[PDB]
Ligand binder design. Sequence first.
Ligand SMILES: Cc1cc2c3c(c1C)C(C)(C)C[C@@H](CCc1c(F)c(F)c(F)c(F)c1F)[n+]3c1c(=O)[nH]c(=O)[nH]c1[n+]2C[C@H](O)[C@H](O)[C@H](O)COP(=O)(O)O
Ligand SMILES: Cc1cc2c3c(c1C)C(C)(C)C[C@@H](CCc1c(F)c(F)c(F)c(F)c1F)[n+]3c1c(=O)[nH]c(=O)[nH]c1[n+]2C[C@H](O)[C@H](O)[C@H](O)COP(=O)(O)O
Ligand SMILES: [K+]
Ligand SMILES: [K+]
Ligand SMILES: [K+]
Ligand SMILES: [K+]
Ligand SMILES: [Mn+2]
Ligand SMILES: [Mn+2]
Lengths: 500, 500
Amino acid sequence: QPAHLCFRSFVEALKVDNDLVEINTPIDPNLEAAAITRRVCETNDKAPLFNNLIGMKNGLFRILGAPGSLRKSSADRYGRLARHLALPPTASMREILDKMLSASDMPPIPPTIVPTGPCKENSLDDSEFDLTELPVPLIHKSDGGKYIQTYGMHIVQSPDGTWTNWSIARAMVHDKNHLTGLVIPPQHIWQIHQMWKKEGRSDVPWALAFGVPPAAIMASSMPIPDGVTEAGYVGAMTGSSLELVKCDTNDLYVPATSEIVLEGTLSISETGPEGPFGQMHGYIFPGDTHLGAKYKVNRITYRNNAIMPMSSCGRLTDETHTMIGSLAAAEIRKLCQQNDLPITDAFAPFESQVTWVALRVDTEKLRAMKTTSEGFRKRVGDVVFNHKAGYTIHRLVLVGDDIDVYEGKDVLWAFSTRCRPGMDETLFEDVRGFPLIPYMGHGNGPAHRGGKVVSDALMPTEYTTGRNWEAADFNQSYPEDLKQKVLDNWTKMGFSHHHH
Amino acid sequence: QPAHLCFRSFVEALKVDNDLVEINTPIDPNLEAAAITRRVCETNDKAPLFNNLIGMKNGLFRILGAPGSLRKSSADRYGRLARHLALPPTASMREILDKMLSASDMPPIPPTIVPTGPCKENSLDDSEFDLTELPVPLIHKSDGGKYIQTYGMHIVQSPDGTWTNWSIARAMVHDKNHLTGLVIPPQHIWQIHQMWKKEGRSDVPWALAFGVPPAAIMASSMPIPDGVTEAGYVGAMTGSSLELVKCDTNDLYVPATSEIVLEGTLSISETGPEGPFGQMHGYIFPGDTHLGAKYKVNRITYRNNAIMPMSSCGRLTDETHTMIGSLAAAEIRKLCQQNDLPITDAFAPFESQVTWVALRVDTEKLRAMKTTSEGFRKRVGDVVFNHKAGYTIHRLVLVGDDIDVYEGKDVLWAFSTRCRPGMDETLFEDVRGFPLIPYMGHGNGPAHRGGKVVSDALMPTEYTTGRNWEAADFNQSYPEDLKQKVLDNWTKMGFSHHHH
Ligand SMILES: Cc1cc2c3c(c1C)C(C)(C)C[C@@H](CCc1c(F)c(F)c(F)c(F)c1F)[n+]3c1c(=O)[nH]c(=O)[nH]c1[n+]2C[C@H](O)[C@H](O)[C@H](O)COP(=O)(O)O
Ligand SMILES: Cc1cc2c3c(c1C)C(C)(C)C[C@@H](CCc1c(F)c(F)c(F)c(F)c1F)[n+]3c1c(=O)[nH]c(=O)[nH]c1[n+]2C[C@H](O)[C@H](O)[C@H](O)COP(=O)(O)O
Ligand SMILES: [K+]
Ligand SMILES: [K+]
Ligand SMILES: [K+]
Ligand SMILES: [K+]
Ligand SMILES: [Mn+2]
Ligand SMILES: [Mn+2]
């Protein structure tokens, strides 16, 4: 099966790419696996595959860390992500986000039901597993539990059957047959949970599939629209119908090649202690435990030699930056265009801990609007900060066409030099806030509301007659023929490869 | 003579350090010298010495570019700066700024007058030079003139004789015997000019010395206090009295080893076209010419084989970042401490185009103050933004003790995650603004007033009981013995030098 359609094949692809380190000696799931993975993420090293995990029994489980993190080289920086999508490993961010948006104006391709698959090779009922005995990692030393779920896909369906959502949300082991996890507004798992709670008749049928098709985990991490079944979006993106098997204990359908599947229910009534979890902004607040959603596990099914993917998340750079930030930015780009705003590109700078999104403006279109900074900032912020796709983002930075928003250095240059603090900004206090950011939930104001800003780094003439500067840089402050001469004589004169 | 006391010896030191490229074939001062230098600055390469400058006659002049820019390696990143000060080339930023502040609580060491020096080896009177015939560089293609003065020291004295100021301010050739340049409030050259204008009797006696002692050009770039003669500050810093010769045509005194000296007057009445100049923020606004100060040159004296230093300034990284930003930050650190504020360190992040300063707070002292963010931000901003040392800085970022302000990545992490936009900030509209920043002079509001902010990236418990998080990073989320194990097995397992 192709890498983008089968996690096992994706692991092969990483090896083949010389982008894997297989570690065949014993590694402790208590912190050691995650510490190695953290080091990988902070240095852009090869992804670690832990084949000998202390406490692995009955095939459960090996671990792959850093599945969506960065490679060291510029040329294939995003290659792990490209490998989730059948793209060349040299794909740019623009090309990856375009691929992730491509299904938004295609008919869905619904999934195909098949009678069995590798995820049925082994099973454990209600009397044979114990989640506390599996080699579930402790990812950060102050975490409030062992976070089994950092890169699997939750599957829940609306009561009426019309929407099946796939998404990533964290969960940790509570006891032998339960997890606790985050289920928070406006996320689709929470929206579906609310529908079941209002019906009031039963717990939510649920499955959690680990090691799913890579193209599926990418859509799981993207805020595609309300009511859109991710499986059909992924089908359209990839040009093929995904193959799903039925769960044994419920009528949900999981990818046929899933490494590990949990089947059970998400309670509409019960909660249990959850967190703290070291995460995306780079913090853990020891002891900050709160009641979370509670999941009951009734059955485990799994591949022979199952592999659990893991995100050792925190400070730069991991899946929480490369996938959450970038995919939100992609959706924001589209949302802006659908609202008739002249946005060409969007990216969440890593330097902002993916709390900002830079929006590149087609300033010829802006000029034709005949507007002003105050008005345009208000319009952009009203569209983005009132939509789910903007939930995690607290600062929008508007920049003109000379800025490559995929280059954080250029975003920072524009922000620092073109946006006058206060005057060129509009604060938004009456919008949903993201409580996970430390200055929100652990800050001075309401955890759930406000704290957002649009920062206009467009210069005044960009609204009127056009850019009226040139950069004081080698590119823009010297004629072409001189630049080329300098370059051609560089090593000759005595000064100091694209792949590397 | 030592490198820090003699520019010629400093050039030697750079060679010796393998930090110079001598270019002995013809180079055009019209853009080519500056384009090579710009490329050096954008890549942290070796400093260029142009020994064969098209239009060099009668010994005037060779050019050294990038005298204060960065080296490529981390270990000696600031070595060029360290070479201005007799510090080891591995000196940290903290050590360089401490050296620059050290004379602030020492008695001055006044300069020593000597009868002659190398700067007297050659001379040209009022009938023998023509500034338009010298090989003065065109530094950026859209500059409004040929900027002879980017790294020399202006020397002016108060009418009463009690204060002699040394400072860098740009100047360009106006005609055969005049320059025009920036002379703007609150700069000391402007403050002294105002004193002469109020006396009303004569133009200001002036000299401009190029290729001065490196320790002197560093003080020239620092906002030491009003009324303090830089020569005595530099004497105290270096532990030696600087040797000065008298000018031939006035009673000012110049460093004995100056490469090139212009003698003349700064008019109290006349002005001429000046600018635009590609500069520190990274921009040139073509055609943005305005009346500047006008200097008359009566005499040139110069060393045999004179060398003119040049800053090809603009986008990162050059003297306008490494010296202007860092030295302002140093002075701000001291100012805060003298106002009883618990600041331990200050630095202007390069990523902000040196428009921000990050202030590291001793949070044990903060806790004892028993204050709040609003109050503390107001206090800090009132001290800094009402003082000349704060003139160029538009955003102050307050951070706690875990942050290394000399590391821009850590400043950006703290700013993005600990400061809630709006709520955790105080805007200052009734302070002097720096008009050179594009969002000021080319922005939406008053060029000279406001646009400043204090951004509090202290978390709430840092005011009360102490830090209540740990970073989700390899350093803080794993015990010591595990970290060390991981490190010791890193290459063993299959993953990938301090000087490199
Ligand atoms: C890639 C990834 C995504 C994570 C995610 C993780 C990863 C690795 C970790 C498990 C390592 C960390 C956490 C990050 C948490 C977090 C977010 F990052 C986030 F963006 C949210 F909007 C959010 F509500 C949130 F809680 N995790 C969650 C989560 O727990 N709950 C959440 O609610 N979301 C989480 N997301 C983000 C979601 O997958 C996306 O927002 C996605 O758009 C949700 O799908 P849908 O609701 O169908 O649009
Ligand atoms: C290192 C350096 C310093 C430059 C400076 C340059 C360099 C390379 C360039 C010539 C390349 C560019 C320009 C930068 C300009 C500029 C500034 F950078 C600045 F910080 C100022 F406060 C300012 F008013 C200003 F205009 N230059 C000037 C200047 O023209 N006028 C100016 O008025 N100052 C300029 N400074 C900065 C000053 O040297 C310092 O602010 C110093 O503190 C002034 O001395 P004093 O007035 O005695 O405190
Ligand atoms: K999703
Ligand atoms: K602006
Ligand atoms: K000075
Ligand atoms: K704060
Ligand atoms: Mn969804
Ligand atoms: Mn001074």
